[PDB]
Amino acid sequence: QVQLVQSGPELKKPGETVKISCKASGYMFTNYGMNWVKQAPGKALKWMGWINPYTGESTFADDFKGRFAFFLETSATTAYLQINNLKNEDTATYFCARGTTIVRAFDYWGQGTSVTVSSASTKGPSVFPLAPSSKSTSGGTAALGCLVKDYFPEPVTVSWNSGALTSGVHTFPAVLQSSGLYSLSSVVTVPSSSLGTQTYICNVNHKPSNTKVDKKVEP
């Protein structure tokens, strides 16, 4: 299958340089356009430009002439976006998108790379259990969770049981506190009879602080 897998989230200071990657697989890399699109928070998609991997030539939209560059590592089937002299307006999710030139469209997209430009240092989350609502001997449904508290910047990743538990899971949007730091909870509902057999571990990953935590959630 066609896949475009981008690199992870970044935190940068104003004036620094960020280089984002997008590894292509499943097609002849050199025969399709590689486009870059920006999505700032709550905003419409903006086309930034493309690089032609057949010829190495770059073309940019008006707003993206200057601090922006595109690069290719053809042997590695990887395309890169570089932004130099980072400003707060650059805080956005950036997508690579394959251009199918035969109908001039963006038929496959990468998953997005989040970049936060900030003067502030990263802070890793503390992870706390939200312990099961009921006991087994009175049945029905029980809720349980993890509180992912006091981190910067966005995003965090939360899975349950290393991705094996997905049904019933709600990871809430992050909210800011007056501290300037994010918190969120992730909850799951389960049969209360399974609390005595099944163990439940939330796996939290905050890449900008290199925090990886597994937390067992029990009574």
């Binding site: 998609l45 109908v103 503390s126 259990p129 509180l147 809430f172 909870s185 509902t189």
Partner: protein, 218 residues
């Protein structure tokens, strides 16, 4: 400057009904070569956009026949017949007839469904957190519609203001409900000065408000 304008911004539609999203460009998308390069993408919650329709009326592979685009020149429409819960997200039109490629601003398709009451759960602070010097109490409202919900905190029967935050999920891709967290945060010392912690929920699906509570230390 080539402007693409979508209307409406938000479109609520019931399951099984027809959704209709308009896209208008400031210049004609008919290329001197003969083609009209007007496309549609769908971006669901947290995800990358996905290719839906190309050159006005052509469905991308895997796109069901209930999606259909039409129009010519400057005015185009995407129609979703028999809307399903999985069709939730932001629809974007795009043009690449004129350099440079541009997107419209997006239309958020919302699903209207029947009222659904929340299941309510209260969670006291972990021991681990209290040892860290703070106390968060979490109230969960799970699987409700509509989104509107009133959640009050009482600590020893005193109404709390100014010390809680709410967060709400996007509509569920299978049953079109929402869930909400309310988090009451206090210092460990304030927390330990009171016994009863209660959250009270008022919602269209409930004939009277539901309270969940716990007594501290138990």
């Amino acid at each position: 400057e080539l402007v693409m304008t979508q209307t409406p911004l938000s479109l609520p539609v019931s399951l099984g009904d027809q959704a209709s999203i308009s896209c208008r460009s400031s210049q004609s998308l008919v290329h001197s070569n003969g083609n009209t390069y007007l496309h549609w993408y769908l971006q669901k919650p947290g995800q990358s956009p996905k290719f839906l329709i190309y050159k006005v009326s052509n469905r991308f592979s895997g796109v069901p026949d209930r999606f259909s685009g039409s129009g010519s020149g400057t005015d185009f429409i995407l129609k979703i017949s028999r809307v399903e819960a999985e069709d939730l997200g932001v629809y974007f039109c795009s043009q690449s007839t004129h350099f440079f490629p541009t997107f419209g601003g997006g239309t958020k398709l919302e699903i209207k469904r029947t009222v659904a009451a929340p299941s309510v759960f209260i969670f006291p602070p972990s021991d681990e957190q209290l040892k860290s010097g703070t106390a968060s109490v979490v109230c969960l409202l799970n699987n409700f519609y509509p989104r509107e919900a009133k959640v009050q905190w009482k600590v020893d029967n005193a109404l709390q203001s100014g010390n809680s935050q709410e967060s709400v999920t996007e509509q569920d891709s299978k049953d079109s409900t929402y869930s909400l967290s309310s988090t009451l945060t206090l210092s460990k010392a304030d927390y330990e000065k009171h016994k009863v912690y209660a959250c009270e929920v008022t919602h269209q699906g409930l004939s009277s408000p539901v309270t969940k509570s716990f007594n501290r230390g138990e």
